[PDB]
């Protein structure tokens, strides 16, 4: 039939065609011979002009004027710019249309049915290290509007050709200390043992708990790093307990209430932002099964299964399952009780399908990496599981870049 | 070129060097990724010729004789018939070799630790329906072993130019009929509905129960199917019932013993058997998970939830995580109970980590497709879910097939 990719959904029985994935024009891992999608990783005036092109094109026909005199003039506007600064810069709204297009563009977020809320923050301005401090607090301040969260993002200046780039060190705005101790394991968060190594060598003088903040490594263009530390009163956190088992407030665990990415670039247009945090507000099982029960992480499914006195002695008890199923249901409950904006992944996967069916209309399907859609705690259990889906790079985007050290 | 596979558990990396070895295309493209996807969207004499070649190649290396004389006068055989028939046949010890590669190159198997351990019986001296029936039920007896599952592979006559394929009809060989009712509902299983109808059109007495076996429709070349109907007793069924909640059992839930997919094709050299049944053991989620929880199944979260007295108002209860996990524990207790072989998913996640291991030294890499190695419940639990993996099509291989009508 139709010569585009054929989804289907094995619950529904429901068939659509991608035919969105004809406007992408970065090539991703995979070839005929073999899938890489498991994989967690992967100017010429010239290129940069197409790409420029087909953002302003982008644009226009967001507004409903392609092919109009406003619409030719901002292309001749940026071939003029790039023709004599081998750069050029976009329009406030220009901005504001693709930060909300490259998050709706990312393959992996679960919760871009919000993709048209994005609150986006201009801070092209910004021209020192004290200044993106400044931003990031504002930032956090009006995400976390005291639990009621609101996605947002603050895109500081461009990387400029012959220039340093505005960078933030921290992988997340806020994320607890990881202490390597003297007998090898570790205090806090493992993930984090070489930002907390990194503060300290500029001069962080390190706590001792497992739930320290960490503070914020800020960069800007050609100066080496400057440290800040957060002010305890803008970091919302919520103390974790279940609703029936007593002892779990106990165990004194403990999440911050802000998810914040702040290592990734946004390319727009061709153009790049390599400092442009953003932020929205987390899916239960980000905290409850990754942070708290990957082995590699706080890794508490052992502590916690005990308490519950189960059978950790041999794998069929499925007790990694019940404990897990415990602990998520605390994270839950705890930030409804605080009143923290929180989303658990059977809602959350339920308006994604939403989101594919909008968006199927709209622009003909939606790139979806399917393994990170899916939950990592009862996957099938949710629809997404049975929704067939095609992975491939929309632009603009957020990519990872390479850490600044 | 060769992939970079890495674990992000371990830190631990290797490189697939097996990948290069896949003559056979994937869905994928570099412009978009469609691994996620279920199903995929006489021969020349010269390109069967050389995957014969191939496969004899294969195989000689495999005893440790390559290049020797059988190896050479082999190839001559497969040569010379191959000119003047455009086909050969397998000899028996070549078609065991095959059908153990065409098991341990499947992407989609997290039971491949085994991949060495399987009987298998040369069915190719085959003429009729009742023939291929005789067959089934020796397989059958033999792979259930009172409970003590054995893997276990039949092989019927290979495919032949212009003469219809020997084919089994149903998926497994063991299945539940489905009933669809009057008001559009179904009873017993939604996936067996269009087979439990051709059974009735080809003249089965059909039952009314949630759980009855229905009968093999055995087709040998160019005749209509014939019905047989499996001996109760061959049958092995397990009831299922809960370490702790007594009213579990109330619930008359049962599962048959014998996982045995029978309609998928073999291929080996060059050579395709439309009809070669295998089977081994269910791995608890299988059942509990899929089989009894999926929205298109059995679909029985809600009455178990109930039966468990929960919230069943607001998803964020976690109710169905919480029966999910129960039901996945009656089944493995019952089975557990009933002294029949049965492996849980992290058990089995665990022996596919050392068989990546075992197969990363003997063939420098394993092809596996992550969302079907993943189990569906407990993902992150479960080592695989932190395994990175290269998928492609090695052969010997099992494929999908037409349904034959
Ligand atoms: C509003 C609520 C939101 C929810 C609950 C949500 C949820 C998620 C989840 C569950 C993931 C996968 C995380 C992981 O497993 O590592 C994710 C990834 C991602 N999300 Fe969202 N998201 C939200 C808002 C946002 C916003 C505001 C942006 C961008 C403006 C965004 C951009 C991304 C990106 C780029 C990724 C992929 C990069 C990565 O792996 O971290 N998300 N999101
Ligand atoms: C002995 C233990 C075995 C277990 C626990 C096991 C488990 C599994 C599981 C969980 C899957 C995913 C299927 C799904 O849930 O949809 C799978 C797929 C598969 N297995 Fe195994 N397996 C075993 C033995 C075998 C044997 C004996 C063969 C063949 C000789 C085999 C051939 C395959 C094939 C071809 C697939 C992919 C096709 C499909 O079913 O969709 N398995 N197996
Ligand atoms: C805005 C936003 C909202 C929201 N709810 N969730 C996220 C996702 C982040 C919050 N949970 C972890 C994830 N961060 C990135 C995940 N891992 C990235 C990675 C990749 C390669 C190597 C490493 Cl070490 C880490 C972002
Ligand atoms: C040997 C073996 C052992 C074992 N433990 N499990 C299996 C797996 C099979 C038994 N449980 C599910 C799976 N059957 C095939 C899965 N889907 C097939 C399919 C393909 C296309 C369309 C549809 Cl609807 C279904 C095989
Ligand atoms: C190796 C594997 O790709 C890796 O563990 C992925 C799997 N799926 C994921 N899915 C989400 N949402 N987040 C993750 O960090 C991961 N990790
Ligand atoms: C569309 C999606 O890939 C599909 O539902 C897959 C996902 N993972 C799976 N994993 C296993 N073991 N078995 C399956 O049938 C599936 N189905
Ligand atoms: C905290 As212990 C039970
Ligand atoms: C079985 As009802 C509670
Ligand atoms: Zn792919």
């Known amino acids: 039939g139709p010569k585009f990719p054929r989804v289907k959904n094995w619950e529904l029985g429901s068939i659509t065609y991608d035919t969105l994935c004809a406007q992408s024009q970065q090539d991703g891992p995979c070839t005929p011979r073999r899938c890489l999608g ?30 109009s005199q406003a619409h030719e003039e901002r292309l001749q506007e940026v071939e003029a710019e790039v023709a004599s600064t081998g750069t050029y810069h976009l329009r406030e709204s220009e901005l504001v249309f693709g930060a909300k297009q490259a998050w709706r563009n990312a393959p992996r977020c679960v919760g871009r049915i919000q993709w048209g809320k994005l609150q986006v923050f201009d801070a092209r301005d910004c021209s020192s290290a004290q200044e993106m401090f400044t931003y990031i607090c504002n930032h956090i301040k009006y995400a976390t509007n005291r639990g009621n969260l609101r996605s947002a993002i603050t895109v500081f200046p461009q990387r400029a050709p012959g220039r340093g780039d505005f960078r933030i060190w921290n992988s997340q705005l806020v994320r607890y200390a990881g202490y390597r101790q003297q007998d090898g394991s570790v205090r806090g968060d493992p993930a984090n043992v070489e930002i907390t190594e990194l503060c300290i060598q500029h001069g962080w003088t390190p706590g001792n708990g497992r739930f320290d903040v960490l503070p914020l490594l800020l960069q800007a263009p050609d100066e080496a790093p400057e440290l800040f530390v957060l002010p305890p009163e803008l970091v919302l956190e919520v103390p974790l307990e279940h609703p029936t088992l007593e002892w779990f407030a106990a165990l004194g665990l403990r999440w911050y209430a802000l998810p914040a990415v702040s290592n990734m670039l946004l390319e727009i247009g061709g153009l790049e932002f390599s400092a442009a945090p953003f932020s929205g507000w987390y899916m239960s099982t980000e905290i409850g099964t990754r942070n708290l029960c990957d082995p590699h992480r706080y890794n508490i499914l052992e502590d916690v299964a005990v308490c519950m006195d189960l059978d950790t002695r041999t794998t069929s008890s499925l007790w990694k399952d019940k404990a897990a199923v415990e602990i998520n249901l605390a994270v839950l409950h705890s930030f409804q009780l605080a009143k923290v904006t929180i989303v658990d992944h059977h809602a959350a996967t339920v308006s994604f399908m939403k989101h594919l069916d909008n968006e199927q209309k709209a622009r003909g399907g939606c790139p979806a990496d399917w393994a990170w859609i899916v939950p990592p705690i009862s996957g099938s259990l949710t629809p997404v599981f049975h929704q067939e889906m095609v992975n491939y790079i929309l632009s603009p985007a957020f990519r990872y870049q390479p850490d600044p050290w």
């Open 38 to 67: 498991s994989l967690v990783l992967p100017p010429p005036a010239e290129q940069l002009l197409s790409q420029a092109r087909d953002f302003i094109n982008q644009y226009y026909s967001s507004i409903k004027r392609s092919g």
